[PDB]
Design a protein around this ligand. Sequence first.
Ligand SMILES: [Zn+2]
Ligand SMILES: [Zn+2]
Ligand SMILES: [Zn+2]
Lengths: 1149, 715, 86
Amino acid sequence: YHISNLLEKMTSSDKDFRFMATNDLMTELQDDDSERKVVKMILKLLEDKNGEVQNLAVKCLGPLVSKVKEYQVETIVDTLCTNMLSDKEQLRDISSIGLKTVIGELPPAAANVCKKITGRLTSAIAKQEDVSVQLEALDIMADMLSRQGGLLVNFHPSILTCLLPQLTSPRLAVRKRTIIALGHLVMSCGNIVFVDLIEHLLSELSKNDSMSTTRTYIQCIAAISRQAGHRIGEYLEKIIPLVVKFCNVDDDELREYCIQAFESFVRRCPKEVYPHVSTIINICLKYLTYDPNYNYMSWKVRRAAAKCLDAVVSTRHEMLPEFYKTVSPALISRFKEREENVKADVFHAYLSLLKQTRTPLTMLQSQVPNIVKALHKQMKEKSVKTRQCCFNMLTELVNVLPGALTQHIPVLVPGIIFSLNDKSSSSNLKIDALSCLYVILCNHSPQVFHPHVQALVPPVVACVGDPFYKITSEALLVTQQLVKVIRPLDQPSSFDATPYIKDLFTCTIKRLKAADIDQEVKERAISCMGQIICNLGDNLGSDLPNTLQIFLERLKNEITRLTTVKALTLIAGSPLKIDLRPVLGEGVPILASFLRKNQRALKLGTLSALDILIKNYSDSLTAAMIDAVLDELPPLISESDMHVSQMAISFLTTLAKVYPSSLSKISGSILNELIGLVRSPLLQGGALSAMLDFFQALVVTGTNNLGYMDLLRMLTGPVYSQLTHKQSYYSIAKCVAALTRACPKEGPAVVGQFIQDVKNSRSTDSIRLLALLSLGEVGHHIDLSGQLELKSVILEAFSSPSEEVKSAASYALGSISVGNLPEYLPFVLQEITSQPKRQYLLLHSLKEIISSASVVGLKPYVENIWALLLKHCECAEEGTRNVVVECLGKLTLIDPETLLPRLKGYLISGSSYARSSVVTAVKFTISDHPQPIDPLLKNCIGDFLKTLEDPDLNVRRVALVTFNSAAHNKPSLIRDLLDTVLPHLYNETKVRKELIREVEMGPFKHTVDDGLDIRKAAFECMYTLLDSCLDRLDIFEFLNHVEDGLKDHYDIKMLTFLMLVRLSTLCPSAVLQRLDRLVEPLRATCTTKVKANSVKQEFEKQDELKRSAMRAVAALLTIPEAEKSPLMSEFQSQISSNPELAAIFESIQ
Amino acid sequence: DQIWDDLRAGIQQVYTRQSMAKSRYMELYTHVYNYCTFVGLELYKRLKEFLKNYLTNLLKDGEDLMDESVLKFYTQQWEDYRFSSKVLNGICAYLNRHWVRRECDEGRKGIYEIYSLALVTWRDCLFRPLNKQVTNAVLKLIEKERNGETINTRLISGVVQSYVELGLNEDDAFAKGPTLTVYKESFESQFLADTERFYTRESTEFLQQNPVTEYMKKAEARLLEEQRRVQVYLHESTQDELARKCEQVLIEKHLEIFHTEFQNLLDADKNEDLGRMYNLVSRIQDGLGELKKLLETHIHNQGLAAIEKCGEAALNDPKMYVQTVLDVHKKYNALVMSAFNNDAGFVAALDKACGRFINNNAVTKMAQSSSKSPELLARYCDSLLKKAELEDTLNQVMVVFKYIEDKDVFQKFYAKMLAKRLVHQNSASDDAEASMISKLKQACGFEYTSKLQRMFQDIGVSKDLNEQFKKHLTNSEPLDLDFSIQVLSSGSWPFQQSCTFALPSELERSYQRFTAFYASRHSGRKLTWLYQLSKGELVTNCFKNRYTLQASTFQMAILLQYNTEDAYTVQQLTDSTQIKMDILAQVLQILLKSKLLVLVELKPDTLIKLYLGYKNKKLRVNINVPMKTEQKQEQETTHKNIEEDRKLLIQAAIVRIMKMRKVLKHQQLLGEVLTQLSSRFKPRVPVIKKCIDILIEKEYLERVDGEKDTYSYLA
Amino acid sequence: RFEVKKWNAVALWAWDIVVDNCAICRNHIMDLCIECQANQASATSEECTVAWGVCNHAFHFHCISRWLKTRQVCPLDNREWEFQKY
Ligand SMILES: [Zn+2]
Ligand SMILES: [Zn+2]
Ligand SMILES: [Zn+2]
C-alpha cells in the first residue's frame, strides 16, 4: 500500500509532493509484479519540468538496477540509449548522466547489458553528422571499458574498427576522447587486436598524409606506451626510427610530442630502450639549446628535452660515467636560461642526477668549480624560485660530497648573506638559505669559516628575532652549529670568539624565556642554550645561575622534559668544568622521580644524566638524594628489559667507585634483584660485563655483610641447598671468578674447596658442574700451577656417567691451560697420544685452548699443534675427525700468512682423507663479520673449490658444503667464481643410477642411495644462491634442474617445492614461460597412489606430500596472467571436478 | 621346540641387511602356519623375548656416543629396524589375522599385531633411555644451523619421523589421523622454548647496537629462514605455532620502537623503510591502527605548515594556495599508493586529513570564514580558463573540490566568472569550457549544469541575431561605426541594472536602429542597457601621431566630452555625463593614472584639462583596467547573497518536509533538513531555528497545543 | 578630437506586459510590498527581494510565495512555476 501511495503522489502536480515521494522511495530502495510501475514512473520523471525531481530520479537509478529483475534492466538501458539520440539536448544530457550512473553501479567481473550498450554505442560513434552524440558515446564507452573491460571480449574488433577512423575527424575533442578510449581498450585487449592497431598506426605514420594527423598519431603512440608499457617493447625497433625522422621537421608542436613519446618509452619500457638511449640523449641535448630568436613558442621543446633528460637520468644507474662525460656540462651551461620554467626543469634534472650519484664522485668533484661559477650568477636575481633551486642544489651537492665546497666558501657566503637580509624575500627562501647554511657548516672543517664569522653572525642573530617561528627555529639550529664552529672543544683552534658571545647569548635567552611560543622553538632554544653553556660558558658573566634556574624550571614540564635532560647531560660532561652544584640538590630528586614515568627514552636519558652528574660532581653529594635515587632502582633491574638493567648496574658501579659510604643501602631489594638477574637465561653481552664490573667494584669497598664470603654464599647457595637452565651455571661461575680475581688473597682456599667438592663422592651432579666451571673460569686469568692434584681430579672427572659434567671437565681443562700455557699445553699434547680411551674430550680442550688464547703466547707451539693435528687427521672413528678438522681450521686463523699455503699444499698430493680434511678446515675461517683473512681467501679459494671435480665420493660433498657456507656467510668471495663453479654444481644434481642399490626380502622392496647426500647438498646450495646472488646466474639453466628435482626423493621434493614457491615471487616472468613444464611433475605427485599393503605412515607421508605439492600449485597459480594457460586451466578443472583433490585443496585453505 | 629353532635362525637373518630368497620367505611362512596348528601365546612370548633381547644388546653400542654420532646411530638403526619389522609382519600375517583378532574381540589387554608389537618394544627398550641425548643433540644442531653453519638435515628428519611414529595408542587400535603425543611431549615444547629464548636474545642484542632499519631486514630474513626450517625438516603440525611465536617475539615486543621510528621515517622521506614497516606490522592483529592515526596527524600538520608558510600573499593569490594543497595531496597520495599497498584505512586517513586542513587553515583565519577556499578555487579556475596540461590541472582541481564542505560558494563564484567570461569574449578555448562543464556534470548535480547551459543558449541566440541585424542594415542606410550587441535573459544572468547615464550623441543612431529592430521582431519585450559592461575602441587625431585606444562606454562619455573644450570642471562633467559621484571619481582617477589626462583627492572645485603632447610607446593602448575596490565590493555582495540563498533553501526544505509528513517532532525535522541539504552545505542549528520561527509568523506551520516541541503543517 | 570606431554593447530583455510593477499586487517592483508595508518592520520585512522564474517573469517574493500555496501556475502564463533567481 505504501508503494502504491508513493506512485500516486509521484504525479501530484505539486513539486514538493513529487520530490518527497521520489526521495523516500529512494530511501526505501536502500516488491514483485509492481517493479514495472516504478520503472516506468522513474523513466517518465526523467522528463519532468522541475530540475530537482529530475536529479532525484537520476540518482534513484543507481539502487534500482540492484533490486529489479534482469529483464527490466534491458528496457531501462534501451530507453536511455534511444533517448541519447533524441532531438532535445536536455533529454540527451540527462540520459547520458543516467547511463553513466547505471554503468557505475553494475558489479564488475551484467554481460548482456554491456553488450546491449556496446551495440548502440558503436553505431553512435560511427556517425559523422552529430558531434555531440559522438562525444557522449565516446565518454560512455570510456567509462564502460574502464571498469568492465574483462567482459565483452568478443566486441573488441568492432570497438577497434569504429574507434580508429575517428582519429581523423576535424574536431580535436573527438580525437582526444578516441585516444583515451583506445588506451583503456589496450589496457585489457587481446593479442591480435593490439597488433592490428599498432600496424595501422605505423602504416598511417609512414604515409604521412597530413601534418595535422601526424601529431594525433604520435600522441596516440605515446598514450599507448603509457597505458600498456610492457606490451609495446617488441615494436620499438620499428617505432623509434619514425619519430627520429619526424623530429627534424620544422614544426614546434611536432617536436614536443616526439620528445614526450621518447620520454614515455624511456620510462615505461626500460628493457627495450637500451639500444636507443644513445640517440634519445643526443636528440635531447641537441634540442635543449633550440632558440632561434635570441643570441645570448619555442620554450616547449626545451621543456620537453629537459623532462626527457630527467627521465633518462632517473632510471639508468649503469650509465653514470657517460652521464658525467656528456650531459652534465650541457645542464651546467643551461643554468642561464632566459625562461623560468625551463630553468626549473634543468635544475630538477641536475638534482635527479645528483641523487642518482648517491668513479662518479671523482668526476663530480672535478665538475664542482663549474657548478659554483654557474650558481654564483644565479644567486643574485630578483626571482625567488631561482634562488630556491640554487640552494636546493647546494644542499644536495654537499649531502653527496661532504667536503666538496672547501675552496668556494668566499664566493658562496655573500649570496647567502644577501638572501638572508633581503626585504623582497619570502619565508621559504629564508628557510632554504638557513638549511643550506646549516648543511654547509656541518660538513666542513671549522677553520674555513673563521674569516666569515663577522659577516655570518649579524644576519643569523636578526633571523632569530623574526616574528615567524619557523625561521626562528631554523636560526636557532644554525646558531648551535655556529657556536660549535666558533670554539671547538676537540681541536686546538686559535680563533678569538669573545665578541659574539654576548650577541648569541642575548638572542637565544629571549627565546628561552618566552612561556608562550611554540613548542618547537622552546626545544630548539633549550638545546641552543645547552650548547652555548657547554662550549663557551667560561666567558659568560653572572647570567649562568639564572640560566640554570630556568633549566630547572623547564625540567618540571612534560612538553620540554627530555630535551632539558639531554642538555644537562651535555653540560655536565664538558672540558669546561661548569658549576652545576646549585642545581644538583634540587635536580637529583626530580630526575629520580622520572624513573617511574613508564617511558623508555626518558628512563635511559635520566639514567645517563644521573651517571654523569654522580661521576663529575661527587664533592657535593648528599645521602638524602642518594637514597631518593636508590629507592626506585629495584623495579628497573629485571629480565624484561636488559638495556635499562645495564644502565642501572653501571650507575651502581659508578656510585661504588665515587661514593662508597652509601652501599649499605643496597642490602635489601637491589641485591636480591641483581642475584635473581644473574640466574636469568637471557643474560648476555653488556649486562654480564656490567654485572662483573659491579661485583669487582663492590668487593674492594669493604662494607659489612658484603664481603667476599657473603657474596660467594649468596651466589652459590641455591646450587648447594637443593637451577633449571645451563646458562645459570656459566653466569654464576663467571661471577665467582670475577669475585676471586678482585681479591686474590682468598683465592687458594676457594680453589681447594672447589677441588674437594668435585673430588668428593657424596656431592651431587649440580655441585660438580658448578665447581668445574668455576675452576675453569678462575684458571683463565689466575695461575693455578700451585695445586698439585688439579689435573688428576679433572681427568678423574672425565669418566662420569653424565654428559654435562664431562663437557664441563673438558671446558675446564681447556680454560686452565690458558693461564699457564708452557706448563699445561705439553701435558695435553702428550695425553692426546698417550691415552686412546679419552681423546674426544682432550681434543675439545685443545680447541678451547686454541680459540681462547693470546696470539703472542701461542706462536711457539703452532708447529707442535700442527704436527699432532695432521698426524690425527687420518682417523677411523668419525667424530674424532671433525674436532681435529675444526682445530686445524681455527689454528689457520693464527698466523694465516704461512699456514694457509701449507694447507693448500695437501690438495695436489695426498690421500682421500687429507683433501677432505683441508677442504673442511677451510670453511671454519669464514664468518659474517669482516676478517683480516678475507683478502687471502678471495685469491686462494679457487684452488679449494676446483675440488668439485674429484673421483672421491665424499670430497665432492665436502666441497659442496664449503661452497654453501661461503655463499651463505660471505658471498663476496664466490660471485666471480660462479661462471666456473656453476656447471659442476649443476652436474651433482643428476641421479647417477650407478650408485643405487636395492635389497630384497620377499614381496617388499628397499632402496639405498649413496648419492642422495650430494644431491641434497647441491639443492641446498641452489636455495642459498637464490637469496645470495640472483643477478649473477642464468635463470633458465636453474629451472631445468629445478624441474629435474620435482621427481626426486621426498626431502628433495620438499626443498624443490619451497624453491618453486620462493621463485613464484622473484622474477615471475621466467616461471610463466616454463609453467607448462612445471605443473606436470606437480600433477603426477598429487595424483599418485600407494599400494594397499602398507602401514599408515606411508599414507600420512603422502598426505603431507600432496598438501605441500598443491601449496606450490597455488603459489604458481597466484602469478598474474597465469590462469590463461592450457595445462594450468586443465589442472584447475580437474581439481575442481575431483573430490579427493578438492578436499585437500580446501585443507590448505 | 625343533620348529622354533628354524624360525629363530631365519628371523635373525631378517634383521640383517642381507637379501633372502623368496623360497626361504615362504618356508618361514609355512613353518609359522604349521606352528599355529589357543596355543599361540608361546610363540607370541618367544617373539617378544627375542625382540627385547635384540634391542637390549643393540643398545650397548650407542650408550656412550655423543653429538652427531648418536644421531647417525639412531637414524640408521631405526631405518633398519623399521624395514625388518615390516618384513616380520609380512611373515606373520596368519597369526595377527586370526589369533590376535580373536584375542582383541574376546577382551585381551596386551595383544597387538606384529608391527605394533615391534614399535612398542622399540619405544620401551631403546627410545626411552636415549631420547634425552637425541633431543639435546638435535637442538644443538639446530642452534648451530641458526648461527650460520651448514648441517645434515637428514639426521633431524629421521629423529622427527621416529618420534611421530612411536605415538600409537596401542589400546584403541583404531584412529584416523596421526598421534603426536610423543612428538609434542619430547621435542616440540623444548624446540619452541629454545626458539623463543634465541630470538629474544638476538633481537635485543641487535637493537642495542644497530638502527631499526637494519633490524627490519634481519627480522624478515629470520622469518623466511624459519619457514624454510619448518617446511624442510619438521612436522606439518608445528607450522602455525612456530609462525605465531616467531612473529610475536620478533615484532610484537618492539612495537613502541616501531611507532617511534615511524615518525622519524615520515619526517625524512624514506618510502622503502615505511613499506618494510607496513609489511612487518601487518602480521600482528590490530597493529596498524596506531600507524594510521600517526599518518593522519602527520598529513594534517604538514598541510597546515605548508599553507602557513605562504603568508598573507595567499589571501589574494589563488594559484599559490591551490598549488600548495595539490602538492601536499599528490605527495601523500603517491606515498600511500606506493608503500602502504593502497589500503583502505590509510586512504581514509589521508581523506580525513585533507578534509581537515582544506576547510580550516591560516588563510581562512585571516578572512574569519571558511568560505575563502572555494572562492580561491573558483578564482584559480577562472585564471586557468581566461586568456595539453590544462586537462590534468582541471582534474586535480576537481579532486580538491571533493573535500570542500560548502560547495555553493564555489558554484556561485564559478557561475559569476563564467558569465563575465561569456559577456566579454575572452576565453582560451571552447573545448576547455566543455570539459569543465562535463566535469561539473560528473561531480555536481543536474540543475547547476542546466543553469550554466542557459547562458550558452543565450550566447548562441545573440550570435544568430547579430548577423541577421547586419543583413537588415545592408537594405537600408548604413551605420558610421561597427556595432555588436549581446541580448541576454534578465532572469538567467547575475548582472544588475546600470546607474544613471546620458548616452553620447555619437551613439544614438545605433541605439535607435537596434531598438526599432528588436521592437519589430519581438513584441512585448523591453530592453535594458548595461553601459558598465559595454566597451569599444576610440581613434584619436589630435596627438603627436595616430593612436587607437580601447575603452569602456563611461570612459568614452567622459572623454568624448572634451572634444569641444580643452578644460572642464568635475562638477560640470557630472552634468555633462550624468554619472554618480563615486563611479565618476574612480573612472577619473583611472584616466588620470594613465598620464593622458593631467589636472590624490578629488573635489568638485578641482579642474581637469586635456593633456596634449606626450604620447604612448605603442600604437594600441588599453585604458580599461578594473578598479581596486570594485572587486572587494563585488566579493562582499556575492558573499551576502549566498547567506540569503541558504536561508531561503532551509525554509523551502522545512516547508516540503511539513507538507509530506503532517506532524513531526523537532530533532527529526533537524535531521531531515541536514540530510536533505548536506550535498551543498552544512547548516547551523540557530539558522534552522530562525527559519522555523519566521515560517511560524507566515502562517505555514504551527505548534500543536500540548506535547510541546512538536510542529504541524497548516494549509 | 576623438572619433568612435566600434561599439560592443550588452543589453537584457524582460517582459513589458507589467509596467515595472507586480502583477499580483498593484505596486512597484522595487518598493516594499503591500502585505509588508501595511505592517511594521520585522523579521519578515528584512527580505522582500524580487523573484524571477524560468519564464522570465518577476514578482515580489511574498506575492508569488502566497500565490503558490493554492495555485501552481504562473499568473501571467499557463505553465508551472520554477524559481531561478532571487
Ligand atoms: Zn507584489
Ligand atoms: Zn514583504
Ligand atoms: Zn510566467
